[PDB]
Design a protein around this ligand. Structure first.
Ligand code: HEM
Length: 399
């Protein structure tokens, strides 16, 4: 039973194990860091089954849950938020915050998303690159999602830059454990004060809605409101940053795709679709324990055994996506959904928001900067460590 998680084959590539498994061993056991086992599911049909089966649970206090690291195991001890809940608790809590994220709400947010992107691009332009390249991550990929989610939560504008930096320290590979933990607690302490403030004087933000609609009637406590807000901040932000950077790198890697997007920015939605399939930057979230025996393919998953369903592997499944290892913005899409945002009731609350942020980026960036170029050879890009989800740490650019 091989150790899991697997390391990526190279900076921008999935782990090499998954194609082999899809071909010869699609449902198989892997060994986790603590010596426990889990079933690894690799085919799109089977990932969808795992994501939707009511015989499977996300509750992390169930013995058999596939925690992938020592830190994951300690994190499982806390009071869960909706990410780790089953029905009916899951939607009881998730419904408290899903209004901001609906397709229609995100459509109505489009002008705000556009203005945020425009403003950050203009700051980049005013800074310029006369003295050499600038880091597209720090200057752009980081602040776009950060400013948006903090603003939606209720953070005032003058606090965005500092809080963006502190949330990045949580996940920066260069942070020490103390630095990351202190940043985590700093943000929680900040959000607690915002909850206190919005309970006394609500404003038109997510924290205020939690306060008025859930804390004041006694449906949740203040501490719960803080933890729900924190989940919305930390769940997806670093993933968004990585997706922006990976999109820029991918366009540089495939010049004719960039040429097409520059000639027709209305292709941004389809570029984003392909990006979210090809670069599955959150690949380790579709995890379960079996509450009772369940058959998956030619395997029996027994009660209290763990399951990891790779959406990354599903998104490269040749039975669903023809020529899956080719990046093609002009892909002819099958009926089956790509799984970049997961599947089933737990499917990313922010899928529509994330796609709108990415579409806005990729329909704007090369209109602003038609001569944007990565300022190092592409083979020297600084990707996330290979034992992590795919991403980019920094990306020197000129324009
Ligand atoms: C391109 C960026 C993003 C990607 C690829 C992504 C991907 C995912 C994936 C794969 C899951 C797991 C879904 C499942 O369990 O099947 C998920 C869950 C979730 N995401 Fe995202 N996400 C992104 C951005 C965001 C943003 C911007 C936010 C917040 C504003 C967010 C908040 C969440 C939350 C709270 C959950 C848990 C949903 C639940 O379990 O009910 N995500 N996301």
């Amino acid at each position: 039973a091989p150790s899991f998680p697997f390391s990526r084959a190279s900076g921008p590539e999935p782990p090499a194990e998954f194609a082999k498994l899809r071909a010869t061993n699609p449902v198989s056991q892997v060994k986790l860091f603590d010596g426990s086992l889990a079933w690894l599911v690799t085919k799109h049909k089977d990932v969808c089954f795992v994501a939707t089966s009511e015989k499977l649970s996300k509750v992390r206090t169930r013995q058999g849950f596939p925690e992938l690291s020592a830190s994951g195991k300690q994190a499982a001890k806390a009071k869960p938020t909706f990410v780790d809940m089953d029905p009916p608790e899951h939607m009881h809590q998730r419904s408290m915050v899903e209004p901001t994220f609906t397709p229609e709400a995100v459509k109505n947010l489009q002008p705000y998303i556009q203005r945020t992107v425009d403003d950050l691009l203009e700051q980049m332009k005013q800074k310029g690159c006369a003295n050499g390249p600038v880091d597209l991550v720090k200057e752009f990929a980081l602040p776009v999602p950060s400013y948006i989610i903090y603003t939606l939560l209720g953070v005032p504008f003058n606090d965005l830059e500092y809080l963006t930096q502190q949330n990045a320290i949580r996940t920066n590979g260069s942070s020490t454990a103390r630095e990351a933990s202190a940043a985590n607690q700093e943000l929680l302490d900040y959000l607690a004060i915002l909850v206190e403030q919005r309970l006394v004087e609500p404003k038109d933000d997510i924290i205020s809605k939690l306060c008025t609609e859930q804390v004041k009637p006694g449906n949740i406590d203040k501490s719960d409101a803080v933890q729900i807000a924190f989940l919305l901040l930390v769940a997806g932000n670093a993933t968004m940053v990585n997706m922006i950077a990976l999109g820029v790198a991918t366009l540089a890697q495939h010049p004719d795709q960039l040429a097409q997007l520059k000639a027709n920015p209305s292709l941004a939605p389809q570029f984003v679709e392909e990006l979210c399939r090809y670069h599955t930057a959150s690949a380790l979230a579709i995890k379960r324990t079996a509450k009772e025996d369940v058959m998956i393919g030619d395997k029996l998953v027994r009660a209290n055994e763990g399951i990891i369903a790779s959406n990354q592997s599903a998104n490269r499944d040749e039975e669903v996506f023809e020529n899956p290892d080719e990046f093609n913005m002009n892909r002819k899409w099958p009926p089956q959904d790509p799984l970049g945002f997961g599947f089933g009731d737990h499917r990313c609350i922010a899928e529509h928001l994330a796609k709108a942020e990415l579409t806005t980026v990729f329909s704007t960036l090369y209109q602003k900067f038609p001569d944007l170029k990565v300022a190092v050879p592409l083979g020297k890009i600084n990707y996330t460590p290979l034992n992590r989800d795919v991403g980019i740490v920094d990306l020197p650019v000129i324009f």
